[PDB]
């Protein structure tokens, strides 16, 4: 019984510490935060999943900069359940800045075909070309959003291979290099001098780890408190 009471004190302490860390991080990087006012009474906060970058984890950290540029602005896109939710958010959510919302029920994208990756692999070598989506981990319920952000672009090792893959007539697919050069088969190239400072993705990850541990402890404590209440 006292062990349960001590466990409750321990969980409460960790939760307090984690919330403080969470708030410190948001203060240091306010772009990591997405806030909105409930657009309705009895608002199900589960309808809003959050910023794309808060919902993924990089599998291959050598591709961190490439993945950052694959997404671009879409790291800060907001994933929600429906376009209905999205409209309410835009209208009634009191957003403090401009956001692009991804509605899971409507979002649509042409994923890279297996045959297309095949061709790219034979063209530049399977070590040197990957579908961006294969390099991020995320919960399955977010599949359609992540296909949209990462499933339509290749990540290649260097500019020469990226160019060869992007503009191959059998492929015609957006490609990004490890250095963050972006080839669009429509006929554009984006690149230049990029900072070697830590990718914003590392900061999202650092915040995600805190959010994840916080969620587990808050759930642990809620359950423990339910049962403590039951002793009476």
């Amino acid at each position: 019984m006292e062990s349960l009471l001590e466990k409750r004190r321990q969980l409460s302490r960790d939760i307090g510490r984690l919330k403080e860390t969470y708030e410190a991080l948001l203060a240091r990087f306010p772009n990591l935060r997405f806030a909105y006012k409930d657009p309705e009474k009895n608002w199900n906060r589960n309808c809003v999943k959050g910023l794309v970058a808060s919902l993924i984890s990089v599998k291959d950290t050598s591709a961190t900069t490439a993945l950052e540029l694959v997404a671009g602005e879409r790291l800060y896109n907001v994933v929600v359940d429906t376009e209905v939710t999205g409209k309410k958010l835009l209208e009634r959510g009191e957003l403090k800045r401009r956001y692009t919302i991804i509605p899971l029920n409507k979002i649509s994208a042409r994923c890279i075909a297996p045959e297309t990756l095949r061709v790219a692999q034979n063209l530049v070598g399977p070590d040197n070309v990957h579908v961006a989506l294969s390099l991020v981990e995320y919960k399955p319920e977010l599949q359609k959003a992540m296909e949209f952000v990462f499933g339509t672009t290749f990540v290649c090792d260097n500019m020469d291979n990226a160019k060869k893959v992007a503009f191959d007539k059998r492929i015609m697919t957006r490609t990004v290099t490890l250095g963050g050069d972006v080839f669009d088969p429509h006929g554009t190239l984006s690149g230049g001098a990029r900072s070697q400072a830590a990718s914003i993705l590392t900061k999202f990850q650092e915040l995600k780890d805190v959010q994840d541990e916080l969620r587990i402890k808050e759930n642990e404590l809620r359950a423990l408190e339910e049962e403590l209440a039951g002793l009476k």
Binding site: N31, L90, T100, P103, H186, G187, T188, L189, S190
Partner: protein, 196 residues
């Protein structure tokens, strides 16, 4: 209240980010234009937005939905690669370049169309001299529609037999993908070269 404090952090951060990104964009463009003027890099035109004009009524719309207005038009991807190398070697910054030769695929694709609720197609509102540049604008804008408000946008985007890309006069966007863009007090404007 902590949400009030963080709202202020966020606003401060947005101001800082806008300032920095606007200066960086201007710095990169001026560097590229010096390479054009000096003749050290041939085949550079300039930013796409300087090559078109649009009625002031649509200033916010096209400024909000056409990132390509800040792309730098050059003759080819080869010249784009020379520019990107230049930017890297002198640690100047980043830009997006349009290979104008790639734009020719749109040459016969620009004819006027019937649109949902007879909304204007934004591309048709852009006044251009050169036909190659007009092709670049079609690349940039395609069949983007202008709606009067977000309700009409949702109607023309989602509710027809087909999906359409639509921007509102206030600068909100619905993409063919399904995404919806808006929020905040900050308005994008002035990204087109004139108001002819």
């Amino acid at each position: 209240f902590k949400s009030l404090v963080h709202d202020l952090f966020q606003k401060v951060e947005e101001a800082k980010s806008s300032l920095a990104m606007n200066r960086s964009r201007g710095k990169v463009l001026d560097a590229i234009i010096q390479e054009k003027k000096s003749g050290r890099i041939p085949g550079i035109y300039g930013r796409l937005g300087d090559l078109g004009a649009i009625d002031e009524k649509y200033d916010v719309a096209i400024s909000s939905c056409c990132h390509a207005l800040d792309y730098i038009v050059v003759d080819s991807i080869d010249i784009a690669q020379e520019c990107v190398n230049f930017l890297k070697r002198q640690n100047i910054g980043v830009a997006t370049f349009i290979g104008l030769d790639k734009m020719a695929v749109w040459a016969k694709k620009m004819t006027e169309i019937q649109t949902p609720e007879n909304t204007p197609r934004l591309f048709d509102l852009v006044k251009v001299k050169d036909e190659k540049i007009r092709q670049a604008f079609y690349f940039a804008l395609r069949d983007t529609l202008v709606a009067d408000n977000l309700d009409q946008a949702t109607r023309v985007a989602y509710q027809k037999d087909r999906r359409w890309r639509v921007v509102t006069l206030q600068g909100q966007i619905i993409e063919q993908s399904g995404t919806m863009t808006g929020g905040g007090s900050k308005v994008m404007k002035g990204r087109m070269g004139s108001s002819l």
